[PDB]
Symmetry: C2
Subunit: 356 residues, 2 copies
Amino acid sequence: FPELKNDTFLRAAWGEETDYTPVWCMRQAGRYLPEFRETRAAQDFFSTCRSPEACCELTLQPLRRFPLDAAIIFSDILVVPQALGMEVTMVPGKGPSFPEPLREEQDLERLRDPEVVASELGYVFQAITLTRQRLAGRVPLIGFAGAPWTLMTYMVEGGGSSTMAQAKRWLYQRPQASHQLLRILTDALVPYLVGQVVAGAQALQLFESHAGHLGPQLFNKFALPYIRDVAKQVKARLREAGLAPVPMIIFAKDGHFALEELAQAGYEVVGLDWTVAPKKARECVGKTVTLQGNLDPCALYASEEEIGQLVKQMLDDFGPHRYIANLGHGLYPDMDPEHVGAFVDAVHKHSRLLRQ
Amino acid sequence: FPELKNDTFLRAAWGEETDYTPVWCMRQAGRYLPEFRETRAAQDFFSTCRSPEACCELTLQPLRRFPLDAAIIFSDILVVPQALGMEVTMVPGKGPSFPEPLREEQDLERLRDPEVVASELGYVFQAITLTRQRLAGRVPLIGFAGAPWTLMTYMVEGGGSSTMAQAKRWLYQRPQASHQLLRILTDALVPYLVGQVVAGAQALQLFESHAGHLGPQLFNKFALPYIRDVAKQVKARLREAGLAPVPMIIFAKDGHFALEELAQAGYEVVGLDWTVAPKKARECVGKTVTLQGNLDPCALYASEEEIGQLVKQMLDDFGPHRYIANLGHGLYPDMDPEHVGAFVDAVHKHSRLLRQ
């Protein structure tokens, strides 16, 4: 692999001082880009995921528009449950869908042994290697996967939900089966994430998107242990393979209640949603971890000038140490690319000015 | 009106010591009750709201099953935007719906002057008077309305949403029009809430259900000021009318970030979702306000024995002072009435035992 030229994102991730704050955006490869819609219209959702060249292209697109300090591989969190044997039908503009969700304990028999998942996800590894080569060391490449609890919500709910009532019903009524499902997911995720690093990912993000549906007690029993397991095991496996460990990010959307624990869970970086004040997030996490976030993505509907001001305030609150700028959630498909660029430019410009 | 016999809920609400912890459940009148479905099947959603006798009946139903320490009038938060002139079409098992949401500033012209809303909501006042008479002083009757921001989300989104992207787009792109809408809502809510008290409500809850979509900054500009306004103005109007002010509850679902402010917003009681640890909620609010909540409603899917234990832990954490037991969100329609009764019984039984 080519020698990484700009490693600001990695340095910030490990806690080191940098000359400016690095920035990237969740869903930077997303429908808000016309060219994204265009190269997606040639296939269908999970078919695009299967073409290394197509995934590489989607990954690169935002980097041609904006001087982002990292690329994130284009994929979907749902590729893991799919690799586990669940059928997906992402259909006429409706998004994530399992037409046959898991509903009882017996449904667990449908799933592949987690030890074979990595071999099912070979196309992802190929896309990562290809992208790492094509980026030619411009900026680091992030790999990613959904956290076990979050993947479980999708597998049980069948898609998105406002309450996770079915998934939480499993936790309360089927605690043993739930732990089994969560361990299967963990055991699939670890080789998948190691594989992404072996293929060339330089950092990893674990996306616990459905954290906030759980209170502290449920989260500590059913989400946290597996989050800790993933980092511990990925790190162990990488060491033993003779490879360097990469910075790992845990993002728990709506996980204000778990920030303290999440700073102790084995991740270099804790990603935040926009509902936590940066100064309060810093109190919760301490001085030991890097923070990532947390601009309300809807803030990008504001004027370019307003975005600039909202960024200035955000950076003032986080301070220059142990910080990666990002949004608090993925970019929405109706957002203006010019406003995305305004956000990237304001982070770079203000963070330098703040250092002066 | 008949002399209130059991006023435990009111005493707890004002901060006074009580012999046991009072308990009620958000949506205690809801589809989880077979008899609720039955008496609803005779009309349609907002037609039921319009029959004083029907609303009274739905209100009373849960009190026949469970020794709840308060009744809450059956209504919908959406009756206010409807009274403002928006058409509702709650249709074949899909829930809240405005087929013609507000989408631009010009749409504000569609709405009635907020000063006439109270006269449009006469049916609610009639249902409250009737229910207060029929309850015959058994327990206090709570009136309620949605908070201005929450009602705005419904009016702009057209119903439920996972992102409130359209509503938050108004805040960012149309801040003046948004403040106008929020003031209209405030100005409609104040006479409506005063009217509920004049008709016989003994407490009031303001439901800020869509709080958590906002971060601290947006919330402080667009949600908090109106929340403060509602309490101040309702209290003022009631004093001037020669009436006693009633305990007021602010419930902000997913509003962990605003708890400190909400304790200063003029409400006797702050209601919590299940994502805040009770002990941390007590730190945020201080010793000046009563707290209400906060059992994860999904916890009721657990065994009766497990519910008992989860309640014991919850009460241990809140302590016996300045506390009203409730769930952290409304009861879900697939829940078992026997498990609801288990929750009510465990709160009473443990809170007495805890006092011994």
